[model samples]
Structure formats: C-alpha cells, structure tokens
Target: HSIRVDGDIILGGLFPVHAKGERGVPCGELKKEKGIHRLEAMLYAIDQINKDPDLLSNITLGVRILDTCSRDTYALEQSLTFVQALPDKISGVIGAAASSVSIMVANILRLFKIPQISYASTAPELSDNTRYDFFSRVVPPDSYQAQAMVDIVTALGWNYVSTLASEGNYGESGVEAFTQISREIGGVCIAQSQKIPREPRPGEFEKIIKRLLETPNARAVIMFANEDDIRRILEAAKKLNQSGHFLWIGSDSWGSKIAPVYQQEEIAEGAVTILPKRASIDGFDRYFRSRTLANNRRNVWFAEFWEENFGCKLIKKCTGLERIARDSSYEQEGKVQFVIDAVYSMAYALHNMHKDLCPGYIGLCPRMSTIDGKELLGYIRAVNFNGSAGTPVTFNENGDAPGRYDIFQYQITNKSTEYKVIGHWTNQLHLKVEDMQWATHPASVCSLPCKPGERKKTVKGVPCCWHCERCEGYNYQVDELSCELCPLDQRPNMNRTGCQLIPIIKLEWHSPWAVVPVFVAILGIIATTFVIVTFVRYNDTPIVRASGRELSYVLLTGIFLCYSITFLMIAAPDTIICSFRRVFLGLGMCFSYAALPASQLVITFSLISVQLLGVFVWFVVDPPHIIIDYGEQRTLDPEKARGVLKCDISDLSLICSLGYSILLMVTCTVTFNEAKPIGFTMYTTCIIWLAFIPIFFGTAQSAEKMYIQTTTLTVSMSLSASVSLGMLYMPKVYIIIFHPEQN
Candidate 1:
C-alpha cells in the first residue's frame, strides 16, 4: 500500500500509483506520467538535496510515500497514515497528483497543520487558503490554463465552442473557470457544457457528442478531462463516425497526454493544448534508467513496476537485470520538472525553518526536535527558489504559482500524432501563427464579420454571436462591435474608422447658380449704363428735364448697386463682402423707392435718411457675417449634407429691413397716383415683392433653399431696377430718341 524509509526527518508523498478501477475495486491500472514518473521525480529530488552538503547539513530527509490508486477516498485513507505517523516521523507532505485526491488529503492535512505541496494538482479550489491553508503547489492553478485555452480559441477566430469536463474537482472546477474567463476576458461564446461521468454508461459520451452536434456551428470543443476519459471520448467519436470534426482546445489536464498518440490520430489531429511551461530535469532520465528492482527497494512497488514493465515474474523467472531504457521510445514526463521543484520547495522550507530555530547549530537543536505543522506552513508559503525548469517559483496570496502555459498543437505526421509547442502564454499570449497548418483558421465565427458599414445586433447573453444590419447611410463604423452616426457636417471616410468633415461648400463661379444670375445682373448694368449715357448726351433737351436729371441719376445709381449686389450674394461670403451685401441690397431698394417719391423732394430725401440710419444699425447690432449652413439638411448620407455658405443674419432680420422698402413703395404708389405710368410701375414692383414671400417662407431643403434665395433675390433686385428704368425713365427716353416733341 505504501513505501517507507526511516531517516532523521520524514516527508510524506501521495502519488496516484494506479488508475481509478471499476467502482467496486479501489485500485486498478498504473498511471505512467501522472503517477509513477511523478513519484520517481520526488525520490530523485530528495536524493539530490540530501547529497548536497550545504542544504540540510547533518539532517537527512526521508519519505513515506503512498499509492493513491487515483481514488479520492483511497487517497484520503492513505493521507490518514501520514497523520498517524506525524506524531513522531513525517514533517511535510509532497503530493497527491489528482486535484480531488489533494483536496481530500488537504482537508485532513490542514486540520493537523501538515504542510502539503502538490506537483500535479491544478484545480483552483486548492488555492482557497481559508479551507486549505497548509496546501501549496509547484504548478499554477487552473484559472490561467482556462485563459490560455480561451486565447487559443480566440486567436483561431473560433467564436462558438462546446465544452466537456470529467466529473471531478479537477475537471469541473477547470471547466467552471473556463466558462467564467470566456465571458469576463474573451469574446468567445459557449454552445454547450457537458460533463463526462465518473462511472460512465454505455452511451454517455455519445449523448454528450449528440448534444454537441445540436449546435452544428460550434465545431470547436474545449475539454477539461483527464487522459483516460479523453481516450474514451475519442473511441466514442470513432463509433459515431464523428472523427476529425471537432477542433479541440484542451486544458493542461488533457494537454499533456499519451492516450491520443495511440491510434487516435484522425480525431486528435489539429488539437491545440495548454500545459504548464516546463523543461526536462537535468539528470532525472539517467537516474531513472539506472534503477533496478534489487537496488530501489525503498519504493515498495518497484517490483510491481518491474514485473509489469518487462513482462516477467519478479521473483524467479526474470533476472531483473533488464533496466528501464534511456532512449527506446521513453521520454521524461513534461511535469517531472514541477515534481522536482515541489520536493526542493519542501526541503528548502525545512532548511529555512531549521535555520531560524537553531541559529548556531549544524542540525536540529533541542527546540527544533518537536516540529509543528503550523510553523512549517509559514515557511512553505514563503518558499522562493529557482525551479528545476529554471524559472522563479513563488506563490501569490492565493497559494497559486505564477502562470506560464506552453501551447501545443497535435499534428499528424507519417500517420502518427506528434505534439509541437507552437506558442506560449505568460498572461499574454504569443503564437507562431504561420507554423500552424490551418485550412480554415480565419473562418469559424458565429456570424461573418460585419461589412464596413454594418451594425452588430448582438444575441441575448451571447455577445460573440450577432446578426448584422446595414448601418444608416453616412454613418461610420467605430469597430466590429458597433457603428456610430456621424455629425451633420461630417461624413464617413473610406475605411469608416471615423468620420470625415464634409467639404465646406458655397455658391462658386463655376456652378450654374452663379452663371445665370451673374449674367442677368451684368445685362441689367449694361441697360442702366445705356440709360444714364443717353440722358447725359441730350442734357438740355426737354426729355431730360422731364425725367428730372438729378433724381434720375440717383435712381440709376441705386439700380447699379442692386445689380452689383448679385455678384456679392453668389460668392463665398467674407466679413466685408457680407457688409457690402447688406449696404447694397437694403439701400438699393431704398434709393429706387426714394427717387420714385416724385419728391416732395424733402419727403423722398427724409425717407432715404431714415433707411440709411437703419443700414448703420444692421452693421452695428447684428453685423452681417458669413457662415457654413449644414444645420437643416444634416443626414448620415453625404449627399444630404450640403454645406451652404450664407450670411449669419436670420432671414427674419433681412426681411424686417426689406419691409421699409415695401413701405416706401406703397407710399410712392399712393403719392404718384396722378402719374399714370408711375402708378402702373409702382404697383408692378409691389406685386413681385408680395408674390415672393410665400415661396421663400415655404422653402426648407438646404441645397434648394440656398439656391432659390440667392438666385431669386438677384433676379428680383435686377428686375425691380429694370422695371423702374423702363417705366419711369423709358417714357422720357422714348420721346427723346423718337420725336423730341414731348420735351
């Protein structure tokens, strides 16, 4: 049942010497890597430390190791033997490979304050110091292993995954952490979570596989099961004809395995695994190869291992001279390094404890003779040294060693599955992506990545799973996560990472808006100049006197100004340009109506004075200034985001000022009632201004609004000037040119 060696100081060890048998039997088959190899590593480490003269000085370290038989209840029974021996012999404990076994043993050990250190156990519950204060481990806990598996899945672009956990603390706690970390740190979603039963039924694995198949797109499987159960799963997969379909992401429990190497190549290919980063111990293989049944009797089961390994009866049929080979298909277990570290950690703790108690003595003094487990636990918790793998070994407050995972990919070469280290993670993942052979790596996702201008409508409780909707026009995508609506003046750039400010636009000389209005204004100027020159050439003529030479010239000047304002209105506005615009547009109308007053010259000039002062106020109270109008027509679509350059004054202000000109027009119409030609023309001017108000007020579209306002204002002013010229002055000019008799 156990191996015992008497020495000055005793250390207890628990290795899963045999596999979990049919429930009725306590122990069954041997576990090579998890059990026997780890047991030998501990023995080897104890030997190395005892031989070193500087480590313990005169005190020799001995071990009373037991076979757990991979059973938690059996391991607990074996650990009780250590507690029984603790009255005098055992100082500290080395292992119990399986997490549940450790958890069982640790519960008993903590009550006695027996410091127990694990080499293989990685379940997170062991790190819960409140329950297992005396427990410490050389390997990191299962949480980081979960993260490493998640990173592997995330890196491969796998969004949806199914999971399987063997029914035990190691598997269940590991799977629990994987699910939690996936939601908290990663974007991967779980399709199904299944547990492989401890005592499996005939179709149990098949049922789990069936559940996995229910989520057809979730072909990536994340499993946290021991090698034995994994073999069962592979066999079930073969029976179901579901081989090579699942891309497996395995935790360290399945990461370091031998079962998949034996005839399970098709299903195991491309399986990525996470193991605690480890290196082979320097001389462990040489020592293991040299051990024989005759010499290594301290291990009670050496004969049992010898008989099973070489296929001979241990007592008589075999000479037992056949030593375990060094290079013939045998490789040192990857976790052997941590086992060595665990032993060294215990030795160092004892040494430090001894040194603190007996400062001047070479060995344990009178005060150190009776050792307490509580005092030893303090030293174990604070143990710090370079591990056999050459990395610093230290525990956090949780008794969890620092996280470092080696990422491996199982590939089929020459018809055999060979595992290769393709990456590693120290909280941060680093992968040799090109080294991996992938037919569909950038492929697996819940939904294809949303297009450049699409919005993600995330699924309920499944963040990674989403449906995409086309983003509103002119909206830019901020990330694959979401798209944002752009500000009114801005539009989406090509990549849609952010918005681009829509180019500031205004009436330009090249546009047809300016061409026709500007051309019409020039025509009005040409006609006005012709009228002015004609009046000048026939100065003494009665036609010139009848037209009132001075007043006609003043009216001509106002018409000229109104026609010129069309040029200012169409250009990109500037401070002075806008100022000139108000002065021209307001007074242009003022002078037209003022001269039409048929003076009571005092009345007409007084009206001009009143409006001229209003022009001063227009510049002072709220000065006319240019602005880019993107307000009314803002849309995500760039086509609707037309930026119009216009004056900042509310159209209300311009309309209010223009009302005085209308007032003058009505006054002039009534005053010139006797002048038939003046009456007709004055009424004509009022009709156009009154008719223009409804169309201007009804206009709302920015692009069209900007065009109509400027174009119509230009046309109205030019036509009003032309109307005054043709009606009032043209009657006189017609007589002057045709007969000269009316003068």
Candidate 2:
C-alpha cells in the first residue's frame, strides 16, 4: 500500500516508526521523534538527488516508506507487499533497523534477487554472504562494536565486569560477540552473565537486580538490549538503589537512545555506550528544522508528533507556524545521517546501473524499466562514492562498512543528562579517549596485573583474569604470559626480569679457594727440594746408602714433579700447559714406580708403556688442549654465552694413566713387604689413589665441573706430596741433620 512510482524508477524503505511488544503488536507510544526524523532523512536525500542535474539528468527517483514497528512480522509483510506490486519494480530496500527484522526480510528479498541495504542492523550473522547474499549494511557489524567495547574496558584497566542481555537474537548475539572478543584480547573477565526475558515475568527484574548486587568485586556491567529492555532494566536498577554503584556499558542497540521519562537521569548518569560513527548532512538539518504541520500536510503523523513533543492538542488552538527550528530536542536525531547515507547508496547504484545499461543516452533511455534485479544488485555492490555524511561509502567482501564507532558517555549536568562523544573507535586505532569527565575509575580486575619479572597464570574459569607468579631459580620472564629459560651461558638477575652473563668460574691465583691449594703446593715443593738436597749431601753416608739413596732420589724427583704439576693445574689452562700437565705427571709417577723394583721389572715396564700410550692416544684423538668444558651433565646458565675454561682430557687417558700407577703400587706393596722404604712408598701411594677416584669423578659430574676438577687435582697432588715427604724421608732427614752418631 505504501509504494511510490515516479518517472521510470521506484525505491523502497522500511523504518521502525513504533515500538512493538513480544507478540509483534504495537504496544507502546509511537517513536515519533527519532523514527520520523530518519524517515524524513530518506526523503531529503531522494529530493536532493532528483534536484541535482548532473546525476540522473533526465530521470527522477521515487521512494516508498513503510512502518515496520520494529517487528520481524511487520517488516516481512511490508517487504512482501513491495515484491507483489509490479514485478521487479522496486530497485532496493533501504532498511529494517533491527537485525532480527532485517534478517527475516533479507531472506525473503533474496529469493526475488532484490538488494537489501540496512542503515543500523549490526548483527554478525547477516554479514555471511552465502546466506544473505543480497544483504549489505552502511553500519559496521557487532563484531567490530564488540571489539570496541573490549578496547575501552582494557584501556580503562577494568578487568572484572558483568554482562546483562535480553533473551533474543540481537541481545544474545551481541553479548556473545562482546564476551568472545574480551577474552581474545585478555585482561577483562566476565564476573557474571545474566539473561533476562524480552518480556519478563512479575518478579524477574528483581531477581536480575539481586543477582547483580550479589556479584562481588564487579563494578562494571555491560548491557545488550533494545531501547524498551533498557528502560525496564534502568527502572529496576533505580528501584533497588543500585544505579550509581556500577558503571553501565551499552551496545549500539540502545546506545543512541536517551533515557525515557519513566527512568530518572541518575540511573543512566556516567554510563558509557558505543554507537555508529555519525556526521552531519550539510543542509538537511536546516530543512528539517523548517518543517511544520501547516506546510507539510502530507505527513499523517506530524500533527500527532507536534502534540506529543510540544505538549498540546489540535483543539487547544496551538500555533501551527511556531518556530520549532531552534529546538535542541529535534537536533537529537543522531542516526538520521546514517539513513541519509542509505538512501544515497541506493540512488548512486541506480544512477550507475542506468549509465551502464543505457550507455550515453541522457534523455529517455530504453530498457530502463526492464533492468534485472540481479544486475541492479551487482551495481549496488559496486557502489563507491563519498557519501553525504562526508566519508567513503563502500562495502567490504562481507558487505559490511569499515568498523568505526563513536564512544558516548552520559554525564549528569545540573540541568539534565547529556550524551557526549568522549572518544572514537576504529579497527586500526582502537579507542582514543578524548575526555574522562564522567568516567568512574573502578576496581575491575580479579587480581592485580602481572608486574615486570612476573608471568601470568590463567585462572581455570576466568579468561581475562590471571595470577602473577615470580619465575623460579634462574628462569626469566620476557612477556606477561610466560617465563622463558635463559640461554646456557646466562643467569637470571635478582628479580628474574632479565638475564646477565655468567662470570667465568676459573681457578685463579688470588681466589680464596685457590689460596689453600696453591700455598700447600708451594710448601710441598720447598719440602721436596730440601729432601733432595739432604739426599745429595748425604750420598756417601752408610745410612743413606743402606736406605737405597738412588731409589730415594728417584722417588723424591717424582714427588717434586707431582707437586710442581699442581701449580700448572692452578695456573690458567692453555694448549701447552694442558698437554704438559697430564703427560709429565704420568711420566713422573712411572719413574717413581721404576725405582721400586728390578724384582718388579715387569711392573715397571708395564707402567711406563701404559702412561706413554695413554698420552699418545689422547693427543691423536681430540687433541688435549685448554677448552671451556660445559660437562655432559651440567645445566646451562642463564647467560651461557661462554664456557668454563680448563684442561680438556679424554676420560680413558685419565683412567689408564692413574689406573696403571695404582696397580703397580699395589703389586709393590705385596712383593716388597720386607723392603721397608719401597713398602712404605707403595702403601702411601695406594691410599692416595683410592681417595682421588671419588673426588675426581665427583668433580667431573658437577655443574662447576671444570672449576672443581682443577681445584681437586691441585689439592690432591699437594696432599700426596706432603704425605710422601712426611712418611718416606722426614725420619732419615732428622737423623742426618740432628743425630750424627746414628748416621
């Protein structure tokens, strides 16, 4: 019934001019102020295009506007009426504001191959091109809006929040979108999620408020509901005296709507909401301001709107030409610009289709009436132009406008609550908060944020909430979520925030640990030197001759060599020193064993041969040299950039050289039992070798492997030389120096 045909083309529009009940009946007062403004915005855009000579020069555009009452049934019914009137006569449908209504009408229009463009429906499901191929929207989807909400939450450091949604497609889908993006971005957890019925029971609102009051530590509540549902929730919150305690976050559904008369301004004060980006149409506001009931007699609802807005009746003799142009209330039509863009988008597509089909014909083009709906749909998809709203109007692959949102905060002034645009949100620049006048800084986190040096440990059920834990031992944390192990040559700092290079742990001369070993080695060398001098001076004494002075001198030489080798072990390890230390120690021990027996001739030759062969094989294989040995069992330091520098020797070479000396000494202890000097030397050597095995092996298997190895070798060599000087030669030296009669 509401179809307008002018010239050769016809366009269609659907607006929610009235609010509806759950059963799809008009239940409340008509939405005269906002709905009529949007309706007028469509007419204004069409008239502008028709007046412009450059666009559609010889053609005129017409529109049919229908009242959907914000219901799916009414929208479907009106869209079907358009389809039945003159086959393929309507070029496109501009709206069905609610996503639920738009989805139903869009499905029906797709069967007829007619294009459907929405001004405000932002549900994510409609963006699926496979299901709603004929559908596109000038407004961005709820996905981006949801992300914008989360961005605001994170930016404000509100980590703990609650959610309230009405039980419908729009409410449920919008809440789901917000919840999902909040988790993916992290640092914001939903403390509670409550779903209220579209039309609630008698005590349902009380139950919802009670639950909201009981949720501890939550100071922010995000709401996804239509204007009617928002009114109900605000009323209930005011009744419970819980309005001012929590900050309310609203989706685009009711974000643009002002608080109704039934609800107090205090209930919505300091509330934050997201809305579609709005820009003013150049001269449309002036035209709308000039409209009056006397001049625009075609508007059936204008008389009713004038009465409701100005608080007067037609019989009361109201001035019909009153200057309503200066009224600020009428300027609150924030979404009218979006409706204007929707109309321009449709007109631009038709103009392009006409040019493509008719080629160069500007006046009275042929085949204009027979333009296919599918061909018109193609043109609509390709419609790209700077819209009247002063932005690029184009659809992405999913048929959605680029995600851009205006963040509004309802602030309570002395006069009334004002909706102020405090920030802007886009996909690229998330949230730019321009003002914080009305924002309430609340405690919004389940736990404190993870500080530097601490990693986040997620709670089992809460996605955005986490526990900050300090990294253990030498581990360090690079980011908030995880603690990473430092590299082999590195170590964690005191706070475990980052790594520092491990100091080279080598045996040095001035170190306290090295002092005792070096002192003992030097003392042992001096004692051994004195013993050799005594043996040389007492060469002709019968006591020295009887004690086997040649054998004693050879053993003394071996002890001197062993003590000197300790100094090499304590010194900084290098290629020549590492090779010389092992070889000389082995050769010296072999020479001492050679002095032990001609009766042990086989033992002497065997020890010499084994020592020489082990050194040779070690040099032939991985050449014995000073190297930074991070041993087989050693763990990496946090700063493992460098290793501990020490003498690197084959285990087999070490075992073979030490093992043969031990074996030779054990044989000499049994064979030369009556020979006191040889027997004493053999017994002492056996004890030293037994103790060296565990100390050497234990050091080889430790984290400070090279450091301990050098220390243990130096200490053990010093102790063994001291014991030899004390046990084998000290008694004879005392007799030679003090008891000349005994000598």
Candidate 3:
C-alpha cells in the first residue's frame, strides 16, 4: 500500500493554472482553467494505468500538484520552496504548463538532481546543460516550429518583412529564431518587437497594432505570441482601414484551435498558422454522449474521455479542449497530446532499461547507465503511430515529427466555422538563402549611392537615402548623422564637427601692410594739435616775437591739416574732386612747412641785426611783463625787478624790433609761396629729412637760449608756436577740408 521515496519531493507537477490579483481570484485564471482540464485528460491516462489489472495494481501512486498559477517567477520559486519544505518523500515530478515556468523549475530541479519531467516546456535551451534526468513533452522546441514558419514565409517570396512577438520568454525566444531564419532566407526583419501584457483592457492593442501596421517596407509580420494576445492584437488590427495590407504568419504558440472561435472573422480571413495535428483517439464520439458536461460537444468529448480513462473529474471547459474535442472527428492532434505520447515513449524506454539491467524489483534508486540513445531515438524518429486523436505521429532527428504539422486558415462562409487546409509541411528542410526563390525582382525603390556632393540618412527597411552636400569648397562635413557642412572661411579646428574663428595675431606679416597708412594719418593729427596749443598759449613771449614762432605754429598746423585732408581726398567718389583735393592738400602741406623754414631765416637775421644794438631795451625790461614776472617768480632772474615799474620806456624799440622781425617772418611766409620751387624744396626737405628737422630746431632754440636772459621765456615762447599751429590751427583747417560740418 504505501511507497517510500528517496527524493526531495514526490510527484510534484507544476501545472500553470489561472491567476488573479491580491484579495481576489488566482492569476492565469483562464489558462489555469484550461490547463486544469487538460491535466484531467492526462490523469485519465494515468488513472487507467494505475487501476488496470495488469499495470501498477500492486503499487500506490501518491501525487503532489504544484500550482504554477501566476506568471510570476517568484511564485514558482515559492512552490518549489514549499515542496522542499515537505517530508522529502517526493520521487518524481511533472507538469509546468508554460515554457517560461518550466525552464525556471527545470533549472531548480536539475540543481537538486531530482527526476523532473515537463508536460509542456518547449523552449530550446531547457535541456541544454541537464545534470538531472530532466525530460519534457519530449518534442521539438519552439525554435523547431519557428524555423518551419520561416520556410513558409520564404517560399511565398517574402523578403522585406516585420516580426512582432510578445514580451514573455516563449514569444521573445520564438521571435529570435523567427528573425534569424528570416535573415538566413535572404530577408530582413524590420518590425519593432511588440508585447501584449497580461489581460489588457478593451482597445489597448490599437496603438501598438497601428504602429506595427505602418512600418515602412513591411510586407509581412511574423507573429510569435499566445492565442489570447494574438486575438486581441488581431481584433485591433481589423479596425484599421489599412489592416490587410500586410501578410501575417503566426507561430505554433498562437496557432491554437481555440483562437479561431473567439477571433474575429475579418482578422482571421487571410491569416494562416502552423500547429501540431490534433490527437486522434479511437471511438471518441460514443464517449462524448456519455459525459455529464454541458451541451458543448467539444467539451463533452474532452470531459468524457478524461473521466472514463482516468479517475480525475473535469475541472472546467476550455476553448482549446473544446476545439480539440470538436476536431476529434476529423483526426486533428494537440501539442499536449504530443507531449503525453513523448512521456509514454520515454516511460517505455525506462521500463525496458530497468527490466534488462535490474532484473529484481529493488525500490527506485538513483542510478544511471547509458543505453545507445541512437537505437531508442531511431525507433521514435520517422515512424508513425496512432496517437490520442487517431492521428499518425512521426519525428525527424531534429525532434520535429513529419506529418505532425497542419496549416489552417479561418474563413466565414456564413456563420459556421470553415477551416481550410491552406498548406501542409512534413520534415522539410527549412528555406535557407540558396533555397529561397521569393521576390527576385530588382527593387523599384533602388537606393542611390551618396555622390561627391551628398551624404546619407539611415532608415529601417528602406535603404539609406542620399542628402545634398551641405559643405562646399574647402569646408568639410561636421555631422554625417545630420546634413550639415562647414563653410570654407570657417574651418573646424578642435573637433572636426564644429567651426572656430581664425587667429589674426598669427598673421603678423599681413598686419603693417594694411594698417600703416591709417596709423600715420591719425598720429599726424594728434601731434599737430599738441604743437598748436603750445604756440597759441604763449604768443607774447620773446621766443615767439624774436623766433617768429607764430609763423612756425601756423606752418606746422597746416602741414598736419593737409595730411588729414589728403586722407579724405583719396576717399572722394569723383575723379575730378579727388585729383583737385589731393593737389590742393599737397600744396598746403608743402607751403606750410616751407613757411616755417622761411620764418627761421627771418629769426636768424633778426637776432644777428639786433646783436650790435647792445642789450635791447626789451631784453633789459623783459618785454613780456608776465613772462618777466613769471621768470622772477621762479627766481630765474633774481636781480631783476618783478613789478610793472621794471618796464623800461625804451622797451618800445625792442617791441618794434620784434614787430619788424614778425613783419620779416610774414614777408618770408609770403615769399615762400611766391617762390614755389623754394617752397616745394623747403617743405619736402623738412618733412622727409627726419633727422635734419630735429637738428635744425634744436640748434635754433639753443642759439636763442644763449642770448636770452630768461631761458624759460624763450623755451615757453618757442613751444607756443608749435602748439598754436599744430593743435589750434591745424584742427581748424582739417575741419574745413575733411570735416566740413564741424567748420
């Protein structure tokens, strides 16, 4: 009656049941409802085996069911935790309906080396590194089926396409294989991945479906998602006016027989899917009438079959179960039945191994001996057997059985469901690039290569389009991602992507050539103004009266004035005006500088002629009373009176003598203009002979200083001439010539 186990957990089956939110119902509610019913079917087979007079009659089968109700990874972990926390009587485990949950639990059980078998795990990587004897619905993984779909797509001549899959492991992994096969068949996958989250509200799939529908160059969308998610996605797609523009290819996961009934006919029109043929059990019609279930013929058949064959009762009606049951009349098969057959085949193999090796019934113990898997594998490979639904079963070495796949299209001819066998495939080599014979026409939208004057813009599905050149001449492109270029005058220095200013300081040779003329004109006016101001402020002093400093100021001022005038004259718009202006301005500078030398000659004559007249009364009286006073105040002439009484009456002769010197200076100024050659020579020599002008002025001033008792008066008066002419008079002349508005 009782069997003692030596494993961690006993007969733990992780059946993915329905789930619900907190303080509410269980999660995966609809899936669990369907799964639990399917479990009833499997239990039917097991109950018959256990109760049969020949099989398990001397043994007891203790069962433990682990509810993998939610899609939560932690919930499955917790289930395993609870099973481990038990009395360790668990011998073997089964069930885990979802591929995602199965992979998770398979890894956990493999770590503990407990024999675990999945009734439904179909992911390819599940058995990759198996340490424990982890078996499965022992069929080809989703990738095997996905590879088949890729072949179908290529045979139909689809090259440029889209692939949309759910976010879950099953859908995501299936899409990866789908797209990989697509590329191998000379096609590109252009669609973004789509995820239909669990239990979406009405119209939630609209935006996502619309975006997928609008993809550029998208000729088809290969979908790998669950039936419910596909139904909702397709329903939203049907609402779009542009819905059927693209071809649809569904994966085995979405090819459930249940989906066709609930899915809209408009959406199901041209849609085709690949799925396992339904299981065909013998004489299932009579069994359907005997069931204590609702009026649904499909549910009645499934419920009755499980109840008669197994001790377990049916849990609830399921769309999948109903679909398989209804199609039982036509010999269709289901994925779950395929899994059940695989498990039975494995059990048969294990039985033979146990019988041959361990002859006696020694209790179950962990031991392993290799059987030539090739022989056992060959027996199952490429051989057809009557399955649960009376359908023939066969498989290839890739674990994909021939004659086990069916492609069905749903159509609405009136109200009744009409399924058409659009295509049939069996153990065919999936299309590779060389085998693909689809869409061989050269694309009408041929991508043009980027020319010398253009760049490229990246786009999906479509080839890169060329953009016209942004940079021209010496300029280079800054951003190829964007259509932008740098101009020739603006070179990019630091980062090749942006422009910067050129440093003029580095080009010093070019500077003086461009700046010297302007510098000369500006400095000339400034120096002239300084000399003129000095002369005007001290016109009454001996230096001016005796040295003819007034004329010197007038001449020097004119010279600078003419230089400024020439600057404006060159800028004149009219040829006649420019010529006249330059000539007049040139003569002005020549005459003015010439007048200074003429006045200097007058100063030399006046000083020589007055030398024999002993000390002129003006010199004794210090004719400029303010100058004499200023001189005395500074104690330069300490012996001289500082008062007005010190003005000697004979100082008139000295003043009259200075007046004749001024008249002579005036005469020389007039003579210089009258004698044009002399004037030209004097002007040219004084301005051009840079060393001579300073030596001449210094010698003349020294001679004046030696004779004068008041050296300050002489120096002050001499400077007053330059100030009066250069500062005061030159600006006035410049105003008339260059700045007439100021004049």
Judged by TM-score, which candidate is best? 1
lDDT of 2 at 617: 76
Q: Is candidate 1 or candidate 2 better by lDDT?
A: 1
lDDT of 3 by residue, 1-743 (tens): 11122222134455544554454544522342344444444444544445555433244444454455656564466456644653444445564667767666756665554445555566666645333234444455776677677767656655456677777787788877776766565554444666676566766689877777565555467787776677666677677755546556787775645554475665555566776656444423333233444543423233435443333455533332333334333322354564456444444444455455546665333442323333443343334455555655554444433334667665555666555666566667332233212214222112434444334565554342334444442344544544353523333433334555532111122342324444555666666766566557656654455446455554665565555553342232232333233234333433443345674567534543453242343344443221121222222222221222122222233234333433433435443222454354435433433342233234442213212322222222233333334333443344434553542
In model 2, where do residues sit more than 4 Å from their true spots? 1-5, 21-28, 85-88, 260-267, 292-295, 318-323, 326-329, 412-417, 430-434, 438-440, 449-743
TM per candidate: 0.62, 0.59, 0.46
Model 1 spans > 4 angstroms off = 85-87, 239-244, 326-329, 413-417, 439-442, 450-457, 468-743
Off by over 4 Å in 3: 1-10, 20-33, 51-62, 70-88, 130-133, 189-191, 197-204, 256-263, 282-336, 360-404, 414-417, 429-743
Q: Candidate 1 vs candidate 3: which has greater lDDT?
A: 1
Kindly list the per-residue Cα lDDT of model 2 for residues 190-247, writing each as its tens digit.
8889998856789787788889888667878898876777787778888888756777
Error of 1 at 207 (Å): 2.4
Superposed on all Cα atoms, the candidates' RMSDs to the truth, in angstroms, are: 9.8, 11.1, 21.3
Best by lDDT: 1
Candidates 2 and 3 compared by TM-score, better number: 2
lDDT per residue as tens, model 1, 416-439: 556888888997999999888642
lDDT (0 to 1) per candidate: 0.76, 0.73, 0.48
